[PDB]
Structure formats: structure tokens, C-alpha cells
């Protein structure tokens, strides 16, 4: 029947700055005529909804996305990979790191 809860914005005045976010819901104004908060020609609601349905060809089915962004300000340190530890030998000239 269509999952109409997943929307996207399809009209904006100007492209976003990187990592900028815009949740407003003002009536877009395409033409020169002012809109006064009501719909009509050249006065469009700015949000559309994917109507997802299970019988959609691939490229039409929902994909979930996660974007990891590593940043490095100027602190002293922070999270990082995991450090593995091996075995320890004794009574032999060895090259060690503790």
C-alpha cells in the first residue's frame, strides 16, 4: 500500500552548504508572485514522499545509508582502532613492546 512516511525535500532557494541541515516547511515560491502561505500555481509545498512498495524494481527500493566522517580538530587525542596483544615468551633474548 505504500510507506508514505519517508519524505525528501525537492525545492530550495539555494544548494546546501556541506553538512548543513534544513527542516523548515515554508511554502516554496517558484514564480514571482508572492505566496502568502497558501498553495497554488508556482506556490508549492516543498516536501515529497517516497511511496515505497515491496513490488518495486531494484533502484526503487529503500536503501539505508550511514556516513562516517572522521574529523581532527586540534585536541590531544581521541578514539581509534583497537590494539591487539600477542603472547609473552620468557628466558629468551627477545624484541619486546609493552
Amino acid at each position: 500500500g505504500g510507506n508514505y512516511n519517508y519524505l525528501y525535500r525537492l525545492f530550495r532557494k539555494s544548494n546546501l552548504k556541506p553538512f548543513e541541515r534544513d527542516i523548515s516547511t515554508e511554502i516554496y515560491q517558484a514564480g514571482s508572485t508572492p505566496c502568502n502561505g497558501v498553495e497554488g500555481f508556482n506556490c508549492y509545498f516543498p516536501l515529497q514522499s517516497y511511496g515505497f512498495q515491496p513490488t518495486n524494481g531494484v533502484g526503487y527500493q529503500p536503501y539505508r545509508v550511514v556516513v562516517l566522517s572522521f574529523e581532527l580538530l586540534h585536541a590531544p587525542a581521541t578514539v581509534c582502532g583497537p590494539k591487539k596483544s600477542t603472547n609473552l615468551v620468557k628466558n629468551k633474548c627477545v624484541n619486546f613492546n609493552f
Binding site: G2, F11, A30, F41, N42, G51, T55
Partner: peptide, 26 residues
């Protein structure tokens, strides 16, 4: 003006594709 017609068709192209779908799925 011509740029108003482009913005007209893109609202058309996303309301039509869904309404044509379930009218053809039924």
C-alpha cells in the same frame, strides 16, 4: 517564463509516477 514550466513538470513527474503505479497495479 520558461523556468516556471520546469518547476511545474517536476511536481508533475513525482505525483504522476505514483498515481500511475497503483492505477496499473490494481
Amino acid at each position: 517564463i520558461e523556468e516556471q514550466a520546469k518547476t511545474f513538470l517536476d511536481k508533475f513527474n513525482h505525483e504522476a509516477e505514483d498515481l500511475f503505479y497503483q492505477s496499473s497495479l490494481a
